[PDB]
């Protein structure tokens, strides 16, 4: 017995805020959170408490501290099968990481539709609002390895496995509505150009290198998704506060056999929110696990990530009605033209028990569709269908990867496939082929039908010659980049310019920077000039005269493309740093902590050391972290209560905490003598918008702070931060 | 043609300083740098210029931009074998990363001894000062994955593969002279506890988490290497500026059969130097590839990493003459007791061509010894012998990993082994067994002897019962930690206290913190109390009265255990940031660059934008990076020349650059009106040691700066940095 006698080693099995308790496996933290998939995993969950330590063959071990040797200082013997089994298993623990999206974080949850969609699709999981479908979701970055940092600038992956009654459906999307390239044949070229360069394997998690921009400059189709990656969409505050998209047009097929084109969306119910670049890049150093951590702790707190599935629907007769090709994955469909129809809600409400077994071995593949859905001829989608099946054969060790417990359907599966590495299922069917008589032909084919039918493809007409040729309808590269740009707020446009400027500054070969700047001038001359100025580049008269590309079906902006143009802020689940001193005004702290609790906003109490401090009235305040240990990067706002300010006023760490929070546009509130910190951040006497200040933390101080938190960041401060040295 | 007209896409094939040219594959950057191993890889080097693009079967491709489809908007066809080959290969790119030391950076080079060692060993590679042995060396961290950052706090690996005329010898060592654990049976326990925790797979690259300190607190044998990890040894400046050690006692065997015990050492000819923690941690975010980059760029510049191989030698009759067991890998052999004898020099002088083919696939294993060496009963080394061969079977895909080109011997190898996956060698021998008559028994066994003999194990006497038992002589855990602690300078001690305080503050369960402080009180009460104070823990009276452990064979200190107590500074290869303005004084720049060139120190010219600025005499200066893009973290010292200082005086980024460099203890030099920057870092008019200042940047100014750089950092400034907000 090595556990403390007070039982403090074990976290409470009830929701608790971030940092209040050590994190735990989801079945120990939330044993009563259940769904059909989590219940079906019971057969493979292994406990531990009260069991003897054994080999994998069930033999009890007496001494797990020592190898068998001839004499206690002698050589180790070959006959030590206990040492060799333990070291052999350790020696073979790693499997290949995913070829892209190697870094990702996952959780269990469930999905329910708001109404039956049987008029447009026979998909069983969308047939009935009382039908609950378990889900497993994995969020990821794209370029870096499984040990790379979370808050890099990158596209994010948003992969959902729906365990439906008619089959697994994987919706394998990203957090932007288009991809970089048009045909799958290019995907190894593009991914090779953005990955670390092959001679020295640098840089990790970054597009800021020459090969990426070389490919971009030569492949203008990439420019649309580049614009999105360079914007603050490339640096989300959390997986909870980004959008998701299936990117491709797919089809829905109803029981009458009618096809409707569809594009899939996820809307974050917590709102859209991103970091700023310097903060994101700093955070890759101070907490490279920040999004992983935030996801897991939101779930343990009860702040479940929620997303609304929505569909943009286009009738078959309207395939050719747009200025762009529906099949072109580098083109978005503006919501002003085709609104997103709300379809259902997904809640992620339980973490995994074991990251390797459930997250790392999870396999998602966009070819996993169910009756009621079908594909289109999008030439990027068509090639993905080959790739995911193939990669999984090496990553997961063979063709029985669907037998790995996280990947198993919860519905029946029976067929004539046999053997392969790692085969779990023991088939008793006399027959392993069909047609057969010796088992009366079971398991049997099922005709298509309105419910529980076999899968049949939509009979789309194909006509043309066998060609390797890009459709001319795909040959337009600048109008969607321009629509995105014009849709952004002025501060979002500043961050895009700063994104391109910082990143192209890292391209070593200057002609590549000049080639990128030339492509920008085909998008928008204001963008191209602002980026050129930062790079010391002067546009030519020719460049200044390129005519802008056309509007997209008459649109000169679509506000749904901006993160911030339409307010959708939600504070629940956000976190505030409170900077303590050794004699805090206890009435400030009561008012601050209860107002944050009332809105589901978490707090972290910070000081110059660990332990406790004592408030004016004798209340013992437990310290969560130090100013250096939990820097401003990790919170959404900063509150300084009154008390003995001289305790911290000369603490370089406390001042720099506020300087960093201020630079990064975060709301700051200063009560009482904490206003002395105004000099640190150069705030005028009569104050400024985004700094909350009062004699005490009572009356309207917390409401004002919370209003700032709902707007996310103080964009109006952008021209004031250029001066502060932080 | 896509290349720019001027040929600027291609780096010059001559040595160039960091940033002057794009980096390149070693055989293209340095085609005249050769050794027997580099030449032998010629069979498998593949060029590219003037060749047609083909499938892997040699079929020329006409259109690599498109899949085959039925019509140009039609579905992709299964008969597209070009698309499927390209996507198959991409889908199967990844192999498992190494179970530990997955993040690493490698180069080729050569070794040669200073004099023959034939009196103590028959090893052929040590037999002749004029016989050069090629090497391949990989440096690494321990815990993080292949995509984690370089400048984490961790132990580092230093693995050298010597391609000798009598077989491959791999010296697989680390940068501290002990390990954390005593018996290989515990390695999976220790590794599991340090690695990301199994529920959520957090944290990457960091021992700052509960499981690791739980293990340490229950396994006091770990404390020695924990001390080294918590010191600035855990955060080296470069792989060129750290020590290497084989850790275990091995044997040398001479031609007369005499065994001598040996421990192996590498001494860095560039000197020992480490970062400070806040610098290291921020650099994981701003350049997570810093050590990989710095190594590759030093080699491209001609600043070849050089190390001296050194042996501590103990006669067989002196095995038991110390206070500690020589076979205990948690114990070091103080150089005050047993001096390191210099043996030879290793120079790393060429980078690889392809990081995956040569670095990722390299296999090092400490069981690869040659005649003239042998093992001892060290029970950590005994289990390593099993593990490396085993793990390479899955990581590298089968038992023919020695035919992967980097791993091949350059000396003859012939035997009766056959087959296995990806067998390259085609054996012509009629026999695949011995004894045989049908091939007159070839290849034949070779008796041992003085040179070119077969391997025979030294006939150590073994006497004991078959036991799983730790030698009693290993059960002492505090005297070597205490020796190490007392051997450190006062600032090194402060950084150890700060390393423990920062890390244990991140441990969530407070009783694990308390149990580690209790361990520290068994080492040194001053250390234990300074950590306790930062953690809000009060030592009990019993803890205050714990008797210090005994001195190590009478030693109260050994200065060879400190990074800095004995100067060994070398400025060649270091880098200075020069902060430009838009009217630089050219006479300042002349003098600065001429003095830096004389000592082989590199310069990076920084400004508030890219492109060029023009000096007072019209010299056009290309800008390397912006003040934000290349922060002070990435240089050794900062110079600000005179010129139009108003251009940069109120730039936040330039002021912050100086404040960060100051906080991180780096030399700063300010010429002429650049002295106006003294106010941002609060230097008095009379000036301060570590800040060089004058009316212009003459010979005297540069000599003082280069003097400061030779002592690496300005330790005397430590008391002044806590009040700077940076
Ligand atoms: C719209 C464009 C695409 C999107 C939205 C997309 C999305 C994703 C996501 C989210 C993952 C990670 C799934 C997980 O969390 O495990 C992924 C992995 C993968 N993607 Fe795609 N992807 C796209 C295009 C492609 C293309 C064109 C190919 C190849 C033809 C491809 C090949 C792969 C492979 C090989 C993996 C790793 C799968 C595994 O190991 O299980 N992706 N992609
Ligand atoms: C003195 C203590 C040890 C030192 C100095 C040491 C050093 C290293 C180094 C430097 C590497 C990376 C080599 C490379 O760059 O590829 C490595 C890899 C490894 N080490 Fe050790 N190690 C030690 C103890 C152990 C123990 C006790 C075991 C297991 C019994 C072990 C198992 C491994 C394994 C499995 C690898 C992966 C090798 C591969 O995949 O090729 N290590 N170690």
UniProtKB/Swiss-Prot annotation, chains A, B:
Q: What is its EC number?
A: 1.11.1.6
Crosslinked residue numbers (3'-histidyl-3-tyrosine (His-Tyr)): 365-388
What induces this one?
Answer: By entry into stationary phase.
Q: What is the main EC category here?
A: oxidoreductase
Annotated positions binding heme: 388
Biological process according to GO: DNA damage response; hydrogen peroxide catabolic process; hyperosmotic response; response to oxidative stress
Q: Which cofactor does it need?
A: heme
**Keywords in alphabetical order:** Cytoplasm, Heme, Hydrogen peroxide, Iron, Metal-binding, Oxidoreductase, Peroxidase
- One Pfam family, please name it: Catalase_C
> Which GO molecular-function terms appear in the entry?
catalase activity; heme binding; identical protein binding; iron ion binding
Tell me, in a sentence or two, what this protein's role is.
Decomposes hydrogen peroxide into water and oxygen; serves to protect cells from the toxic effects of hydrogen peroxide.
Q: Hey, which family's this protein in?
A: Belongs to the catalase family. HPII subfamily.
Q: How does it assemble?
A: Homotetramer.
Q: What is this protein called?
A: Catalase HPII
User: Which gene name does the record give?
Assistant: katE
């Amino acid at each position: 017995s090595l556990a403390p006698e007070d039982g403090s080693h074990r976290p409470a099995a009830e929701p608790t805020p971030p940092g209040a308790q050590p994190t735990a496996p989801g079945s120990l933290k939330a044993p009563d959170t259940r769904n059909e998939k989590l219940n079906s995993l019971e057969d493979v969950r292994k406990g531990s408490e009260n069991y003897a330590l054994t080999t994998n063959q069930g033999v009890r071990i007496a001494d797990d501290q020592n190898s068998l040797r001839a004499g206690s200082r002698g050589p180790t013997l070959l006959e030590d099968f206990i040492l060799r089994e333990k070291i052999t298993h350790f020696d073979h623990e790693r499997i290949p990481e995913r070829i892209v999206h190697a870094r990702g974080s996952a959780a269990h949850g469930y999905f329910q539709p708001y109404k039956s969609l049987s008029d447009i699709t026979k998909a069983d999981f969308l047939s009935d609002p009382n039908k609950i479908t378990p889900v497993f979701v994995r969020f990821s970055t794209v370029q870096g390895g499984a040990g790379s940092a979370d808050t890099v600038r990158d596209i994010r992956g948003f992969a959902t496995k729906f365990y439906t009654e008619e089959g697994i459906f994987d919706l394998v999307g990203n957090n932007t509505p288009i991809f970089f390239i048009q045909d799958a044949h290019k995907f190894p070229d593009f991914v090779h150009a953005v990955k670390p360069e092959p001679h020295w394997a640098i840089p990790q998690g970054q597009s800021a290198h020459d090969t990426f921009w070389d490919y971009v400059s030569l492949q203008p189709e990439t420019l649309h998704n580049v614009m999105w990656a360079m914007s603050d969409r490339g640096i989300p505050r959390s997986y909870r506060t980004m959008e998701g998209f299936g990117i491709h047009t797919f089809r829905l097929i109803n029981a009458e056999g009618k096809a409707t084109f569809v594009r899939f969306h996820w809307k974050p119910l917590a709102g859209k929110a991103s970091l700023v670049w310097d903060e994101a890049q700093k955070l890759t150093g101070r907490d490279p696990d920040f999004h992983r951590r935030e996801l897991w702790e939101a779930i343990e707190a009860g702040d479940f990530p929620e997303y609304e599935l929505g569909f943009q629907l286009i009738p078959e007769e309207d395939e050719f009605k747009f200025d762009f090709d529906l099949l072109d994955p580098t083109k978005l469909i503006p919501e002003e033209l085709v609104p997103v129809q709300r379809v259902g809600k997904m809640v992620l409400n339980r973490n995994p028990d074991n990251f390797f077994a459930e997250n790392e071995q999870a396999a998602f593949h966009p070819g996993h569709i169910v009756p009621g859905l079908d594909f289109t001829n999008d030439p990027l989608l068509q090639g993905r269908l080959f790739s995911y099946t193939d990669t999984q054969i090496s990553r997961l060790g063979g063709p029985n990867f669907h037998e790995i417990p996280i990947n198993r359907p919860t519905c029946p599966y029976h067929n004539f496939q046999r053997d392969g590495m790692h085969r779990m299922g023991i088939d008793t069917n006399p027959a392993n082929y069909e047609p057969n008589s010796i088992n009366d032909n079971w398991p049997r084919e099922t005709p298509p039908g309105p419910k529980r039918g076999g899968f049949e493809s939509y009979q789309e007409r194909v006509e043309g010659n066998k060609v390797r040729e890009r459709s001319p309808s795909f040959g337009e590269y600048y109008s969607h980049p321009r629509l995105f740009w014009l849709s952004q707020t002025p501060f979002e446009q500043r961050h895009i310019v700063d994104g391109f400027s910082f990143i192209l500054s890292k391209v070593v070969r200057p002609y590549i920077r000049e080639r990128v700047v030339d492509q920008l001038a085909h998008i928008d001359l204001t963008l191209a000039q602002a980026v050129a100025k930062n790079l010391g580049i002067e546009l030519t008269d020719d460049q200044l005269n390129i005519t802008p590309p056309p509007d997209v079906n008459g649109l000169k902006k679509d506000p749904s493309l901006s993160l911030y143009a339409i307010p959708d802020g939600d504070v629940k689940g956000r976190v505030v740093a409170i900077l303590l001193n050794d004699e805090v005004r206890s009435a400030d702290l009561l008012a601050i902590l209860k107002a944050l609790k009332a809105k589901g906003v978490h707090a972290k109490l910070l000081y110059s050391r660990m332990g406790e401090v004592t408030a004016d009235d004798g209340t013992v305040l437990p310290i969560a972290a130090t100013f250096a240990g939990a820097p401003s990067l990790t919170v959404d706002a900063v509150i300084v209560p009154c008390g003995n300010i001289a305790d911290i006023a000369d603490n370089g760490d406390a001042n720099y905490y506020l300087m960093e929070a201020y630079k990064h546009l975060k709301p700051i509130a200063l009560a009482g003598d904490a206003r002395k910190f105004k000099a640190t951040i150069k705030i005028a006497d009569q104050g400024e918008e985004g700094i909350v200040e009062a004699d005490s933390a009572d009356g309207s101080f917390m409401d004002e702070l919370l209003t700032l938190m709902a707007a996310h960041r103080v964009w109006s401060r952008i021209p004031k931060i250029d001066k502060i040295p932080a």
